[model samples]
Target: MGHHHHHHSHMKPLAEQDWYHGAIPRIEAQELLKKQGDFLVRESHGKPGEYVLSVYSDGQRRHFIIQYVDNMYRFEGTGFSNIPQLIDHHYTTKQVITKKSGVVLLNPIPKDKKWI
Candidate 1:
């Protein structure tokens, strides 16, 4: 069987993506996202120097640090998925959360604190 191989070397570095302006391809980006609809790649809240590439809807999100000129996002973290792997402990663990029932704590007040 003759299988065509697409080498990762062909992909342009994320630093060079700005050369073409905002002309990123949807297909390639969608392939990396792998969401149910093309509506998968929606805008999201991300950290500095990162782009939020969403999937599912809001429950699962992938914050792409760098995007290549070939419409690919770079995520080489250990123990993670290809594109949507950005959902780490930071995403899973709710720092400032709300209660649905049987709980109320407004009078006590929450301390203004953030941790990494």
Candidate 2:
């Protein structure tokens, strides 16, 4: 093993981020996102490594499925190495999450850490 490419293995973690609401339902994400451009990352129920990006925009909540393929995370195009990286990239670039809805990640809905 001559320093194998562990880029995928050492990829960023998601649970540490405040915007990450683990295993939350779609309705719960909706409740969290009230204003436009409000977004949060949540664990997806479909696959093991999949994630969901819920963004409130255009007077509605749009959920874009973030799929993990080939050791990369992506919603539509351009594979992101990690979840937060994907989020931050969009945040910094002011890119629309979706072409049709034009959802932007202006506000990150943090997880309410009241109970636990």
Best-matching candidate per TM-score? 2
lDDT by residue for model 1 over 39-83, one digit each (tens)? 222222333334433222233322233343344443332322223
Q: Tens digits of per-residue lDDT for model 2 on 1-116?
A: 45885555543467777888887777888887778888888886655666788888778888888877888887766678778888878788988776766677797777876565
The runs of at least 3 residues in candidate 1 whose Cα sits more than 4 Å from the true structure, single-residue gaps closed, are: 1-9, 15-47, 57-116
The true-versus-predicted C-alpha distance at residue 6 of model 1, in Å, is 8.7
List CA RMSD, all candidates.
Answer: 17.2, 7.8
Task: List residue ranges in candidate 2 displaced over 4 A.
Answer: 1-12, 45-47, 114-116
Clashing pairs in 1: none
| lDDT score for candidate 1 against the true structure | 0.29
